[model samples]
Target: RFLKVKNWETDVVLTDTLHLKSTLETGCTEHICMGSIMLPVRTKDQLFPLAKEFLDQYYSSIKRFGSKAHMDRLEEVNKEIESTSTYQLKDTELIYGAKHAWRNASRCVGRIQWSKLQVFDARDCTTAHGMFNYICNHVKYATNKGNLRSAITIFPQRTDGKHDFRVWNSQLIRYAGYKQPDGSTLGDPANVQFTEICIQQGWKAPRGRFDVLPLLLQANGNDPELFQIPPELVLEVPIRHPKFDWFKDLGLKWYGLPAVSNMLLEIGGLEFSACPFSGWYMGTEIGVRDYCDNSRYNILEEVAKKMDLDMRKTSSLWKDQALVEINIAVLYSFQSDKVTIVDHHSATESFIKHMENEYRCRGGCPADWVWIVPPMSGSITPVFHQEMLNYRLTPSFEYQPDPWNTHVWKG
Candidate 1:
């Protein structure tokens, strides 16, 4: 039996129900305390549909391998699970599914080594403290001093009798933004709004350009809670140029690891709302987008001025020159610091190789043309000239809305 409740304000339609035992009563510590409807927050009914999607690809690939023994075992396991109505993927399946999600994440250009991803099953985590601990460990391990490693930590799945667990931060290593009196942001402009929310939640944000944001966690239906990350645990790289010695004067720095924390991890028919994933840096992500994008640092002119470029005329191509220098600086700086970062040229080449490998593996790999191409040198990269097709893939990680964006929920 299905019970439906539509919250137009939240644009969420809940229609899944967990069958209550004939003798057991339904109650929990975490209940959505509405006006008088103190009911349990159930899991969304996407279990079977999503599981089948994941299993189909898994099954098909295994069949193509001609592993007759494994194929027969899969059939029996699949039928057994269907009859039992429990969407529990085996340990091997979970590992493979996590890697598949990375391979399927269209925005990521480093999908070639998806098989090398370090997957951590933290589904047993039930408290904010537990979430914080696991995330700290993930950051430490992925940071690897300076040579960043790709890793993901999957949290508990939302069930019918409980609510979804979530991470409030967009990325694990995001800098805090402080709005000043003159209607300007002091740190990261993108994080000003989130910083305010964190401050309102009693988090004492440090006043600095590169202060890391705390890990905010939501356990089931309860209000999100904040936890501070240890300073020594984070690996940060101080950016400097190899040629322009004055480049160090700008005092620019960014964290070595970029662990994305807000995306939802959908594997089989389950959703792990608090799964955090990480990848090594691409020079363009930092030098071009994060540092030069208008919404971000917007330092194109500042950099041009420092380099004494002819900015008097648009024909001078001062912006383009500054962008190239900045990208070169980023690559040189990271390498000097013994950090793991890829240059746009190598990254694009690697991506093309990835495309070729995937083509051989799956006829044609789904990719976004805009995302695959490097930010600078549009005509140079091989991916820039290629016409790519995009398709929806299962066992994928997807972007989710921020919890603090809505005021309907409590702090």
Candidate 2:
């Protein structure tokens, strides 16, 4: 009995001996796991059914299920779809659907605050320059002078998938990575390729270790236009430890808003290709992943050496010591600056509470076990022990092909 399910809100429990067949199937098999693989695109014939289901969910959520208004709205949507082969979501529907997409995001551990998201409707945006303005406003509003808030600015939905608006940057805020003559990376290694693209698009590279990359906005499948984010709108926190005075000298810093820009937002059957979403950082995201990851900054060895740890021996646990210190610095720096951030311990605890609520309401909460578990202190966290099943739910945020990979630029 490897799989054990329980409803904490109620007293119901089930063991592996009793199996309930899942109605949905992910891209996985007994031998191969395709949990991280992107879902295939839906055919045109599948659109209305998905749209109707989402409408049903929305109406039910507001306690107006099957009412005259709900039926009339459904009829209107159906008529629109029949005429134009696609339907538009009312502004209220768009807001509700965006929040629901966040809620259904299985990879996100911060879904408890999904309802608190601020939605900026930029569906009226029609140009690359217009996209830049919307993004800037989103950055300023979400940054909130270092008091970060969760927000998403949605662009127009994909009409035919060919003429799509896209954000070429992986995130709204990220450091440029320059390849040095000595084969060393200057800034964030993850952004090296994107930085190169910006340079090709006639952007002057600052070549600084933490210089923010320019935004690449693509409208109507045209060549992406580069736009610099106003420096004042980008709130950054300087890393300084509570105890280590020398930590301030590292010159380490990170952006306050973690605005993911490339992911697709699917609400009903409509796919929004340029919806950028932002949230306050969780400590480990900056400390463990961004700073400590080997592919990213890879700062552990340097920090460990600075601490004068016995790096020659694994038993010294020098890496662990350095990790804790770095994480402490991250939390301390954000806290000192009054920026909104959550420690991993508290974030995980809140996630467990969210899972409980999901179980009490929806029969099951789709979760990816690998993603939900904190990178540090695996077994110590509650979610590390909890069994989770991964599945797809709509409306949802999904991985999409990079814009450059799919589009041919005109010289």
Candidate 3:
């Protein structure tokens, strides 16, 4: 029982080091089991060999060496690992591997539909422009005329002696963060660094509070290129208050899709360096975290003021009230736009269902409790009461270094 705790799994000095980093909320919380033994897997110069050796041994025993013939097969597999670093998967394999990766993704709450992910194999892409074309297509399809659908487009895998194909955007859809001279931000604070990188990379950012930065693409043998997202391709929802007539005056909005980038797609001892995936938004992820986090928009105080709540006293529950109303606005806006978005209440329920499905299918599911619970109205969500155990699971999506920080490109 104790062997599976995150502390034990993630310790680099240990015999079996698991790279499970926590992405916390108000408290220590977070996913993506970068299933390799090496800590800070991105920085480790020797990746493929280590990962292959490590995962081969791990999965081999897990599969059990029942016969000498099987052992010989395992030996051949080990030799295969030592010889090659580049890997390719058939469409069916990629589809299955992608869905399985989503199923094994620890932070995702919308896992009930994991098997429904639409996958695109973009391994043939060898140019930055080519990568951007597939990305634009992904954005358009995942946006889905506002009825958003989960999807992923995979790029090339890291090879032994070749430049990597990578995407620099933190997500396929995100607002640009422009840093003002006064040390203030004009857009999402979380994106300020990336926005700056965009500027340095020759993207002419208008420095607007909501300017969507161009896609940064780094091909296997070329310099990174910037491609502006077509206006019609990006489906953004203008935020309005559910009850307040003045809410529309706030001029706030958000993109319909949240496609994560620079995450490694690990499947069956293979690593895909450029796989971007998206799922429909859960209201609180935008309202509570993006809008209310002090490091992000920090809109709680602004909303509280507009609501005329007493912000001077902690007893007044001003932030809490603002958060609830903001979340309501988010849900209202997405629903009104005919976009497929999930509320925290519905999302948590789906997570529970996912767990049950996983239990019946795979015997167990690994989950992070702090992340599974909603930021607001936790007592009622079934996930709040459920005890969880988090550990490494293969055929998963794991966090990797951003292109700007890696050998792919430096800003």
Return the TM-score for each candidate structure.
Answer: 0.83, 0.93, 0.82
Off by over 4 Å in 2: 1-25, 34-44
Provide the RMSD of all predictions against the true structure, rounded to 1 decimal. 12.1, 3.1, 7.1
For model 3, how many clashes? 1
lDDT for predicted candidate 2 compared with the true structure: 0.87
- Candidate 2 global TM-score: 0.93
For model 1, the superposed segments whose C-alpha errors exceed 4 Å read: 1-46, 63-86, 406-411
In model 2, residue pairs whose N, Cα or C atoms come closer than 3 Å (at least 3 residues apart or on different chains), thus clashing, are: none
Better of 1 and 2 by TM-score: 2
Instruction: Tell me the TM-score of model 3.
Output: 0.82
lDDT of each: 0.76, 0.87, 0.75
What is the C-alpha lDDT profile of model 2 across 324-410, one tens digit per residue? Answer: 999999999999999999988888879988877776676556777778888998777777767777767788888998888888778
Which pairs in model 3 have colliding backbones? 23-30
Pick out the ten consecutive residues of candidate 3 with the lowest summed lDDT: 8-17
lDDT of 1 by residue, 1-411 (tens): 443433333344433222210112222234642222222221224344455556666766667433675456556556655665545667778898899888876667888879898988887887888888999999999888987888999888756524677888899889998888888778899998888888988998778888889878887646788888898988787888888999989999988888889888777767677889898998899999999989888889989999998999999899999999999988888898898998877887788777666765565565656577788897777666655544446677776777766424753
